[model samples]
Target chain A: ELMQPPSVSVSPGQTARITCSGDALPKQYAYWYQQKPGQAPVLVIYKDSERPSGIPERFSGSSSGTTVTLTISGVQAEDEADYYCQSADSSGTYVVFGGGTKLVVL
Target chain B: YELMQPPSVSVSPGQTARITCSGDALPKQYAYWYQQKPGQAPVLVIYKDSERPSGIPERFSGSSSGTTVTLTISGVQAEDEADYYCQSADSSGTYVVFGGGTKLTVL
Candidate 1:
């Protein structure tokens, strides 16, 4: 299982860090997804911190031990959405997801 | 390119619902399925094309044909009404792609 903060608030141009925690997380690569209302969640960061094509550099990811962090720099109003962190367990058969954090850009 | 899916589908309880995800190179990669309810994170129902994760209902199954992958929920229940999304790794395995998502309305 995974856990995340319920929400995070940040002003435009500022930065926000959302953390995801789980057991035995460091052994597997973490992925970050961004979801807007009425839209599918898009992969923002994968394989720990690699951004997919078309994703801005403002989004970044990192991990330490059992926790992973997705940092969005220069927050924009358009960035307000729910973000989730996911990773495979040690068994490498299935995926586990964080509870999801709502980023409120003010 | 992102995978494509119907915006919404409706079915009566005890019937079956099939959601499809279409991609140009999807058949070359393994497909995964997820279910997301209102204001909640998604949970994986099927992985590696058709393998169901532990605890997932056997009624939920996945299959691939050509460039399209299908998620079939047989004997759909009221609890199965949710947004469904399909994902797969790119042909190069460099990144992942998600379907537009399909909403299952149980009536």
Candidate 2:
């Protein structure tokens, strides 16, 4: 009954941090994925800040707040991804993915 | 882009629910589904959120929502696994997504 899905709320022009926690993992490498409605979950920020190719500069990431943060300085249509924060966790050395933060992009 | 959460539904790790996604601008022509394994990166389960990815099991599926959409997994297995996500385009000429994420655990 203790479901702490990763979540972040933000207003237009302001930055928001998504706080995510679950079973922690041994490895500290947190990966982020973004999925807009009707699209693929693109790799946004991996190992923090290192975004996939074609991703805009407005999108940046960092590790803090007990969770990973995907910041869209200037929200864009393509910036939408069911932003998920993933890290190694208690389960089988597999990557534990946060429930995901829906970036509104205001 | 605009996105909405249709209340909160629960699914046992082995069961599945049809997660729906709606867009405000464009007609949701396609959708995709992803599984974020508890400690690993998210893996693509269904594309267009409907078409099962090559290796994905048939239990997972995706569909449209009139601008909205849905993802249904037939026999959600314990390790079938991870949080499911739905993504689609909106009428705003931009893309939208569901608020937060749906949590699926093995019951």
Candidate 3:
């Protein structure tokens, strides 16, 4: 018998894409989350590639992948979160969220 | 919507667990909670991350803590909400969300 790894696998410095739909809200927006042990997942990216100031460049994103990537230059405890990718496929339509990504800060 | 923070928690299968959220809001007044089972999509657990959706097990409940809110699952089942999420309004006047997601596993 053979063992199979998880369906989803990601590594540091690599990018992960999340394909999702839009929300009922007016504009189409997407957000990414990062959760750590005993802590909450914080919003790392929102509205596509627009990251908040003070957010490291390593945490870059784009919607073209129909996805977003949280490229951590260096994984930190604060970087951890059950990473979730969300987006509104259509404006004012139902917002869809992606299955969260487990960031292992190894 | 704006940025918010939620507490992280863990529990074993058959054991209850709780997570929390805290923040201010506009346009949106309710807190919602979601559960993500391993290799599965996130499921709506608690709306506003508080009120349980219809048909949800009675074992699941939600409450608040000084702008912070809580989601409690009694006698957790493996299929119960795995990775929980809390979201709220953002400082930019847009919706911001908690970055960290809580993980629950069965012991």
- Candidate maximizing TM-score: 1
Query: Which prediction has the highest DockQ against the true structure?
Result: 1
Task: Name the runs in model 2 displaced over 4 angstroms.
Answer: A1-40, A43-106, B6-8, B12-14, B95-98
Q: Individual DockQ of the candidates?
A: 0.16, 0.07, 0.08
Superposed model 3: Cα runs more than 4 Å off: A1-106, B1-8, B24-28, B91-94
Cα error, residue B38 of model 3, in Å, equals 2.6
Model 1 residue runs over 4 Å out of place are: A88-95, B1-4, B7-18, B22-34, B44-81, B86-100, B104-107
A1-106: candidate 2 lDDT, tens digit per residue: 0112445455566665555554342225555666455333665555655654445567787765355556677565445456766565444244355666666655
**Of 2 and 3, which scores higher on TM-score?**
2
lDDT of 3 at A10: 49
* True-structure RMSD for candidate 2: 9.5
**B1-107, model 3: which lDDT tens digit per residue?**
23344335656787877666556542344455656666554544454445543335668787765567677888987666467776544434444445356566655
Clashes of each: 0, 36, 41
Fnat scores for every prediction: 0.15, 0.06, 0.11
- DockQ-based class of model 3: incorrect
lDDT of each: 0.82, 0.55, 0.53
Candidate 3 chain B minimal-lDDT segment of 10 residues: B1-10
* lDDT for model 2: 0.55
Q: Per-residue lDDT of A1-106 in model 1, one digit per residue for the tens?
A: 7889989999889999999998858787777878767655666776677665546778999999999999999999988999988777776666678888999987
